[PDB]
């Protein structure tokens, strides 16, 4: 949800937070039993029962609305 | 003499009581051990039940 409420530049933040959550799951799985992180991630992304999740939908929405008509490219720096 | 007979009879009681106590102590320990094994068995069973449900939802069509 936090990613869905910001621009496309929050992708790095989402990946970092996801890595933290995965590590916490690994630490907790040492003493407890829990569902696989992939299953929980798919559950939160609404991807288990649907071909596409929320992250891809937001990326498409951001590309159509903000990124494309508000960014200028520079081939020298890519 | 009666005193010697009483000592022997009380020894019979003492050993029997000790045997009874040992059985009870084992019974309590066995109950605790089986319950622990039972609890961990339930933990795996519920995890399997959740996993199969997730798989069924992932594969179900419609």
Curated annotation (Swiss-Prot), chain A:
It is found in: Cytoplasm; Cytoplasm, Perinuclear region; Cell projection, Lamellipodium; Cell projection, Ruffle. Coiled coil: none annotated. Transmembrane segments: none annotated. Component of the CYFIP1-EIF4E-FMR1 complex which binds to the mRNA cap and mediates translational repression. In the CYFIP1-EIF4E-FMR1 complex this subunit is an adapter between EIF4E and FMR1. Promotes the translation repression activity of FMR1 in brain probably by mediating its association with EIF4E and mRNA. Regulates formation of membrane ruffles and lamellipodia. Plays a role in axon outgrowth. Binds to F-actin but not to RNA. Part of the WAVE complex that regulates actin filament reorganization via its interaction with the Arp2/3 complex. Component of the WAVE1 complex composed of ABI2, CYFIP1 or CYFIP2, BRK1, NCKAP1 and WASF1/WAVE1. Within the complex, a heterodimer containing NCKAP1 and CYFIP1 interacts with a heterotrimer formed by WAVE1, ABI2 and BRK1. Component of the CYFIP1-EIF4E-FMR1 complex which is composed of CYFIP, EIF4E and FMR1. Interacts with FMR1 but does not bind to related proteins FXR1 or FXR2. Interaction with EIF4E stimulates FMR1 binding. Component of the WAVE2 complex composed of ABI1, CYFIP1/SRA1, NCKAP1/NAP1 (NCKAP1l/HEM1 in hematopoietic cells) and WASF2/WAVE2. Belongs to the CYFIP family. Breakpoint hotspot for the Prader-Willi/Angelman syndromes and may be implicated in autism. Commonly altered in tumors. This is Cytoplasmic FMR1-interacting protein 1. It comes from Homo sapiens.
Swiss-Prot record, chain B:
Residues 32-62 form a coiled coil. It is found in: Cytoplasm, Cytoskeleton. It comes from the Eukaryota. One of its GO terms (biological process) is regulation of actin polymerization or depolymerization. Transmembrane segments: none annotated. GO terms for molecular function: identical protein binding; protein-containing complex binding. Keywords: Acetylation, Coiled coil, Cytoplasm, Cytoskeleton. GO terms for cellular component: cytoskeleton; cytosol; extracellular exosome; lamellipodium; SCAR complex. Involved in regulation of actin and microtubule organization. Part of a WAVE complex that activates the Arp2/3 complex. As component of the WAVE1 complex, required for BDNF-NTRK2 endocytic trafficking and signaling from early endosomes. Homotrimer when in free form. Directly interacts with WASF2. Component of the WAVE1 complex composed of ABI2, CYFIP1 or CYFIP2, BRK1, NCKAP1 and WASF1/WAVE1. Within the complex, a heterodimer containing NCKAP1 and CYFIP1 interacts with a heterotrimer formed by WAVE1, ABI2 and BRK1. Belongs to the BRK1 family. This is Protein BRICK1. It comes from Homo sapiens (Human). The chain holds residues 10 to 71 of 75 of the full protein.
